[PDB]
Point group: D2
Chain length 392, copies 4
């Protein structure tokens, strides 16, 4: 299959590329791949473990190898021998110039960038470039996945975001104020009939306009925002207090990281998207709102080793308060990268099975799953299992 | 209903007694009670929140109030005002002298004790005293629950434990070497046609002899070993690594506590029962065995504030190792006490619904659930929900 | 001796009052009191353990007992029996209306308040009321200690803060914009010839004007900002990396608390004072600046149980990065309250020994010690010991 | 200078060798080296940063490079580029066959071993081989340092360990039952007039016989047992509670590690030496004994990444209990290796300054410092500083 990655030179993106190729060359295990679990036996009939890559970027380096090595230098999150073995393949992946339209002040932290809007192009002309890039790459086994820096919350508009006609009016009128990069890539993917997933908390396809578009075009889509670490634990663990009829009175979630993701989320406007997505899961699972605090702070020496500190304050029998702590110490690109490969395969599977619109049953992958109040990790896993069985 | 508690002066036992009465007098919330969750609406048709108590003990204090206050003095795990309000009721609960037969060297740590076997009685004569105590108390709405100190692993015997005839032969021949206290209380309960649950990792009714007996008598029973804290988290959290196709390579579980439970488990023979029950859950959930260490150590200043330290070492994409820590800081009697009330109500419900033999669907309460490989907390909760719906 | 407490109805203040009296009535140990350590034998010649209290407040409750009980209800940080035993004594402590001039937006969180500036008084007239209150209480064995809510960083002024003449000009001209409450109480104390200590990060006497005043008047003073918990650990532990020639690359300090202190510090202007005081210690000890983040967030269920989460990222041999975590779980009023009693006794001792100006050797008590670059806890303790020996 | 390392193929030993050479070739910083701190300016007059290595082993691999690479493969605790750069130098370091006499059951975990006692040699003949090996290597700038696996507590003997004549009688009579390997290497070093340090909790030179010998020979020696991680923190942090007049009621110290050190300490007899050395520090600092538990458990996936979990339970004002947690996550060979280089330089310095007998002022390096009750890390550092200034 083929995967077009928005933010193709990022660490999540390059590590998926490194991993896919290491696994194909037979020099890496299949650990981390949800699509490789026993329940999904037979997926390879529809989506074999076979990947060609391209994508859009605003940080233009020569190729995906140079991009992968920049992240490897700082993080060393896989062996030098894996880097070397996949060098050839990754040198042939060259990203195209994308758009950073309305992606917030945090984009400044990426350093030297070049964008379509910087060239003076209108919305219609930007869409045409994005579509031409994708369609020149795409086949009938192609998916588009957004793994680009997290945008701020969009300037929402009922007219421009509430219907497909309103959104196409937005493009026609060149109303840039209401367009964000993530919307434009999602729009392009679906207009081309390509399945789409948004691994970030940027709006992407999660506006009514684009949900209408995906349905009309009969195209499957999924999102939003990869559930990889702290939020994974929160949605696995919060149900335990509910099952035991305990009241959660407080939940603290504090996250420190560096690298480009920590750099972008250092900006208050970009951060808000990620923070709300991490925070809001609690009420959906419990039925009520514990006092919750969720923060992300830049902490440069950790690079992509995002570390989370959580504290849960809870009541039990007779009103007695009790306390639970956790620390997650993990590399973000290592828990994220396989989910990109899994999302791509499950979208391809969904496409071939005639699935259209939001694939709500892929909620398991996401912190803010579209079209569903199923948040509990256990419930989401059962939904994913049962969905695949129903269509297999 | 009526509940006969083996180990009636213990902290789990007295706090269930304090709690039941506080809730009946309308001075405490219903927090902590699984049987009070919305899904179990209508349980009160079969098992209303209404409790009379008695039980067996080897530490003879005057009454359950004096017992409750001894634990309250050291722990202050509920308000002085709750203690005062329930004093009358608890002063009327007087335990009967039980048996500490083959309950290990840790029983020495309980201080001043008096037992049936100390009086020179044979197995048959001990059984008669235990039965007379229970039957003088029991009605058609009576359950027996074991919350006594954890025994060592029994001297197992195919002849004496493998069939009811073999076990009754054991009693007839006065073969004390193969009898443990917990077996004798379980035997007595079931011979009397009373539902039974074992909240400890002592063998109790979990031998083939007594499982045969419960079936023959048409009596429901449940166990073993309350899942309250660290093991609750382990069975909620370990599935997350499986769902995400990660390999757990190591899991460390270190527990410190004081009070009478920490005192008994300071002995190496008593400890082994609790340790194996906490440790063995991992393989059943994952399909394989991470290097696991599970310890319990005495740490007197914590009293009944059992604190657990866990560390999970796990592999993800490309073989990368990553790390997860947790600390549970809770009072053991507060997470355990409501489960005693819930177990009693669900046993009464099961009894009235014609349920007989091991109620395997009550696995949710237990670290070592009888007759089931369902260990995942989420799965167990669904099984409990669905079981109750099926019989309601 | 006599202690006039600014913020007399606060939890630190009332717990010092509760503690002093419990210890005098012989119903509490002397644990927590630095002045009770063997090295300080003979202090009781100059400052016996004997305390009468008064102070200023803006939250007017009837008396210090009602104030103490309000905090006890929420926190239960000492026994009901201690509360009862000291009720009489504390009912006779009645605070006087003080000033909340330029104490930031966080003061709004205190609820119902009444202030001198609210009555329409000028700076000169406010100073006269504050002085009249203190002088009506004071004797030759009286000290004034600031334990009031943390102010924002002041609008600094060279003219008005840089010399005593400039500060007295400020009062004469009624230039309120440059006066803060803490400055006015410190000014009043020193004008009256009374020793002064500032337990908060508010400016207090730590401006050149008031340092000049204390010297001229021959009056000892000490501050700023009680070092009680997280910062205590930081100044004990950071030296270990220096002694071992390790580079600290990052230090994260995250603090959650409730109660009135957490409420006031929820405001961004008030918070800044506390944050800088906690953060700045690192460079002074190490000679360089690790990337440091220090936050305080409101977390209401913890009440006065301030909990801190720290993470230290450090380099050792060959550049290898390594990691250290800590969690402090303590009640803030319990670690602070004895230091108020100790500060008072050491100020009285200093006064009687002819000490004047900043008592820099009391740095041990403080996060931002005036007139000293001695920050290491070990060094500060030796300085305090040696100071007392020199004057004994 | 020259350093003869007992246990020369171990990870602490090989990493000191790797580090020394990387630093000499100018490809590594001097981070981690206490002897490189500003206070020790001028040490290079007596002990320049210049090292030639040899030693004894029982695991015979071809050379120290092969040994270093075996540990590097599993741990990756320095760059492949450092490994490559020092390969030549380390290939020329070839260990000689030593003795594992009475080194406990844990020695079995080292795999394929060869020893002097296995050849049938008497004590006198073993001593001669050990001496011949060392003297063939040694010059006037040579030190011997023990970094071999931790032995069990020795079979102590007043006659054989209490005087030099008694110890030499032991050798003469071939009384193996009372000799341990570490004693024999220490004996040989001192008989040869070479300074000696013991980085392990094995007895080494810490018996009266060998202390008498070092004095008579006018030879400086130091030990015992490198203070590198958890115990470093404990001796830095415990003084904080004393300075603040708090009572420590409980201290838990739980350590997990793998590699060869974790393997040897998995044995109960070997473990006891390390456990007592880690545990006993508390009383010496505080004056009393908190309930303390100290454990080390094998946890193979961590390899040389020893992780420690500590919990401190402490009383403060009015008897209130409060709680402090810490987690140390570090590589043991990285914190240990520079101390070997520092110990060697400070021993050479001591030798040239006419120092003889136990260098008690090197206590800073050690968990069980010989001839001193100075345990507090801060105090030890001041003692080391002042010692060096006095002799410089
Ligand atoms: N576990 C995880 O790492 C995880 C989990 C959930 C969500 N996410 C989200 O995934 C995204 C990727 O994470 P990452 O660590 O790879 O960050 P990264 O910064 O290393 O990668 C993002 C890449 O996208 C590029 N980019 C930014 N805006 C773009 C635009 N509009 N068009 C094209 N390219 C653009 C950047 O130049 C960068 O190379 C982030 O938004 C992050 O918040 C990551
Ligand atoms: N969260 C929890 O507290 C928890 C969880 C799982 C299992 N358990 C188990 O529940 C049991 C009770 O815990 P606890 O904290 O109340 O301990 P406890 O020691 O305070 O209570 C046990 C009581 O039973 C008595 N006893 C011991 N052997 C007896 C015998 N053979 N016959 C009659 N009485 C006997 C003791 O005197 C004591 O009063 C223990 O076995 C414990 O391991 C507790
Ligand atoms: N361990 C600790 O608790 C600790 C450590 C260091 C510093 N501090 C500082 O000590 C102070 C007291 O802490 P607390 O927990 O008692 O808080 P608290 O809010 O319970 O006490 C402060 C009291 O002062 C009053 N107040 C505020 N402004 C005033 C003014 N200008 N004049 C007179 N009264 C005023 C408030 O009404 C309140 O009763 C805070 O500034 C805090 O940041 C506390
Ligand atoms: N931070 C630390 O790593 C640290 C701190 C304090 C003490 N120590 C102690 O230092 C020692 C070395 O630690 P390591 O991690 O290098 O362990 P290691 O097992 O990797 O090294 C010990 C080496 O000595 C060898 N050996 C064992 N007995 C011997 C004998 N009698 N004669 C000659 N060689 C012998 C072994 O074969 C091995 O190569 C251990 O005793 C350990 O407990 C280490
Ligand atoms: Na805690
Ligand atoms: Na870690």
């Amino acid at each position: 299959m083929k995967v077009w990655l928005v933010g193709a030179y990022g660490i999540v993106s390059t590590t998926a590329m490194v991993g896919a190729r290491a696994i194909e060359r037979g020099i890496a295990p299949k650990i981390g791949l949800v699509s490789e679990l026993p329940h999904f036996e037979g997926i390879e009939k529809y989506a074999p473990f076979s990947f060609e890559f391209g994508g859009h970027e605003i940080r233009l380096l020569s190729n995906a190898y140079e991009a992968a090595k920049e992240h490897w230098e700082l993080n060393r999150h896989f062996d030098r021998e894996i880097l070397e073995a996949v060098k050839s393949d990754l040198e042939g992946i060259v990203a195209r110039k994308g758009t950073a339209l309305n992606c917030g002040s945090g984009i400044k932290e990426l350093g030297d960038i070049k964008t379509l809007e910087g060239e003076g192009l209108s919305l219609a002309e930007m869409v045409s470039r994005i579509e031409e890039d994708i369609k020149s790459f795409a086949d009938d086994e192609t998916v588009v996945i957004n793994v680009a820096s997290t945008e701020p919350l969009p300037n929402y508009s009922e007219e421009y975001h509430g219907s497909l006609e309103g959104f196409e009016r937005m493009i026609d009128e060149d109303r840039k104020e209401y367009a964000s990069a993530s919307m434009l890539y999602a729009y392009a993917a679906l207009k081309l009939g390509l399945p789409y997933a948004n691994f970030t908390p940027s709006p992407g396809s999660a506006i009514p306009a684009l949900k209408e578009l995906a349905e009309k075009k009969g195209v499957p889509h999924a999102g939003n925002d990869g559930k990889t670490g702290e939020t994974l634990v929160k949605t696995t663990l919060a149900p335990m207090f509910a099952y035991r009829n305990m009241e959660v009175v407080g939940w603290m979630s504090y996250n420190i990281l560096g690298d480009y993701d920590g750099k972008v989320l250092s900006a208050r406007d970009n951060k808000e998207s990620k923070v709300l997505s991490k925070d809001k899961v609690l009420e959906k699972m419990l039925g009520y709102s514990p006092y919750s605090i969720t923060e992300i702070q830049y902490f440069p020496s950790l690079v992509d080793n995002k570390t989370a500190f959580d504290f849960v304050h809870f009541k039990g029998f007779l009103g007695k308060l009790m306390k639970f702590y956790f620390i997650w110490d993990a590399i973000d690109a290592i828990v994220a990268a396989p989910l990109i490969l899994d999302i791509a395969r499950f979208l391809l599977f969904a496409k071939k099975k005639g699935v259209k619109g939001v694939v709500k049953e892929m909620a398991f992958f996401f912190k803010s799953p579209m079209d569903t109040n199923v948040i509990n990790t256990h419930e989401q896993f059962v939904v994913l299992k049962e969905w695949y069985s129903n269509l297999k």
